[PDB]
Design an enzyme around this catalytic site. Structure first.
Site, PDB file in Angstrom:
ATOM      1  N   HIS A  41       0.701  -1.220  -0.155  1.00  0.00           N
ATOM      2  CA  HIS A  41      -0.229   0.215  -0.223  1.00  0.00           C
ATOM      3  C   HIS A  41       1.039   1.244  -0.278  1.00  0.00           C
ATOM      4  CE1 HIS A  41       0.396   0.942   4.418  1.00  0.00           C
ATOM      5  NE2 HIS A  41      -0.569  -0.306   4.747  1.00  0.00           N
ATOM      6  N   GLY A 143       2.693   6.314   9.724  1.00  0.00           N
ATOM      7  CA  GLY A 143       3.566   6.759   9.286  1.00  0.00           C
ATOM      8  C   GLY A 143       4.740   5.569  10.270  1.00  0.00           C
ATOM      9  N   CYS A 145       3.871   1.881   9.095  1.00  0.00           N
ATOM     10  CA  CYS A 145       3.353   1.009   8.399  1.00  0.00           C
ATOM     11  C   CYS A 145       4.904   0.243   7.798  1.00  0.00           C
ATOM     12  CB  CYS A 145       2.861   1.265   7.580  1.00  0.00           C
ATOM     13  SG  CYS A 145       0.888   1.695   7.509  1.00  0.00           S
TER      14      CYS A 145
END
Lengths: 304, 305
Positions: A41, A143, A145
């Site tokens: 993503h 952030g 991730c």
């Protein structure tokens, strides 16, 4: 003596964290040998996330659209492939700080250390349990991730988790390092049901053993029970059923303390039925389920 | 979102941990530049520890009596000095993994990360508060002595704690890196009174702010209070008195949430008087005091390094 929720030392993992940028979106990547792993993503805008076609979105991207920074060093991307919900970016340089490592899919009830990262830079380290419903209760801001979960066996880092998303309920979902989600989750911004969660019974028993070893013994009673009798009470209080495999794993703690597993089950049964009467066990006012039998043994024997 | 008891990344400290051996006794050392720091009781047998004369014991030792191992590499000791309750072993090699670092004496109520080590090898990392009575509630087995506490400010490691001893009560006492004990403790195996501990009031309020930010708001009341009224209740429940300095430190969390510090005090007052009625705050069934206002801000704004 004493008992603390202890993370693995994060040094070996810190040296593998990088920043991955694709257009507007920046998150964390894991650099091992000549491959960078990150959530797919990274290629999505906030609009795309509502209903992304990852195949179509990835086709619009070339190697040079992926900015990979290891601290202040820029890596050259010479290849990109999608594996489930992770992107594998082939880079021209092997990570010289690559530890001995394995990719493992962990079971529900197992624990691991999370190195929470932002823009490829480590923020902090803490110990998590994978919930029976395959969620984790982490600390993960915008952030975070691509932050990874891991165990260390002497020199070998077993990567088990890559942070993917926060569900609307504020619980966290992620993948293994092959990009397969833990639980029924997909990488899109929709409402997604985590299952009914349950308490990890074998972990609660392990922690009661930890308590006895450190001299908290008030909850030890004059009762015993059967697996069947105990499991009827387990079901009523949303505890995982206890199996003989679980009894076998608790064996060493049973041997150390001289308290038979079924006698400790009878203690837990009375705690569940009667609560704790405002008392504490190892500084907790509730029953802790984020220590595995192996975690308690490691801490109560000082493994490095 | 979410809120966890988070330690600093331990990488910069891992590269400084060594094994120090003097005869029978092995514990952990901190190798920075060309100096290894460890507890001076490395020179003691189990008998010596009952009533050690450290000056006399250290005179019986020379440089070559100190075995210092960095993983598999052995360091050459070319000097030894006692500074308070720490030994400074001068080695012939500068640690190439020496981070930018400071030695700091922390205040009671402040927090730090502990890298628990055995035989100079890291075991685990966890976040501690220095108790008002200058003890810590750690996890420290035989051989954990010389394990260090630290904070990281971007690139700079501030070493604040070196683990020295377990008291008979099973609580932990240690020194700064100049070898001065936190609290009234001495490095001998005697009964030593820690004295009455109190809850760190400013930390509990910070954690209630953390709770509101993460959506746990059940405890919020419309009752309010004065510093004086609140401190009468604080005294009754063995809480540190709240000062204006404490109110000022909570200011940013007050500004973010729009809950005045004295309003949060009135929420804490009712929690203390009435308990929590079997509810939880950020997954705890008691009031947590091991997060500083700076800890909550760091975690709720994602500060790195």
């Amino acid at each position: 003596s004493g008992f603390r929720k202890m993370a693995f030392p994060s040094g070996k993992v810190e040296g593998c964290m990088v920043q991955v940028t694709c257009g507007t979106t920046t998150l964390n990547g894991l650099w091992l040998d000549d491959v960078v792993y990150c959530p797919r993503h990274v290629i999505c805008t906030s609009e795309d996330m509502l209903n992304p076609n990852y195949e179509d979105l990835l086709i619009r991207k070339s190697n040079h659209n992926f900015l990979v920074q290891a601290g202040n060093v820029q890596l050259r991307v010479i290849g990109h492939s999608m594996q489930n919900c992770v992107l594998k970016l082939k880079v021209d340089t092997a990570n010289p700080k690559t530890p001995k490592y394995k990719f493992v899919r962990i079971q529900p009830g197992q624990t691991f250390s999370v190195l929470a990262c932002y823009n490829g830079s480590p923020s902090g380290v803490y110990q998590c349990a994978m919930r029976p419903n395959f969620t984790i209760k982490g600390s993960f801001l915008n952030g975070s991730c691509g932050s990874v979960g891991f165990n260390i066996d002497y020199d070998c880092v077993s990567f088990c988790y890559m942070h993917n998303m926060e569900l609307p309920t504020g619980v966290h979902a992620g993948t293994d390092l092959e990009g397969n989600f833990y639980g029924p989750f997909v990488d899109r911004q929709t409402a997604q049901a985590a299952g009914t969660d349950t308490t990890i019974t074998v972990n609660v028993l392990a922690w009661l053993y930890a308590a006895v070893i450190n001299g908290d013994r008030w909850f030890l009673n004059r009762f015993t029970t059967t697996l069947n009798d105990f499991n009827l009470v387990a079901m009523k209080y949303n505890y995982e059923p206890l199996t003989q495999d679980h009894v076998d794993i608790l064996g060493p703690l049973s041997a150390q303390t001289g308290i038979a597993v079924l006698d400790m089950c009878a203690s837990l049964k009375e705690l569940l039925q009667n609560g704790m009467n405002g008392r504490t066990i190892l500084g907790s006012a509730l029953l802790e389920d984020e220590f595995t039998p192996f975690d308690v043994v490691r801490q109560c024997s000082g493994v490095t």
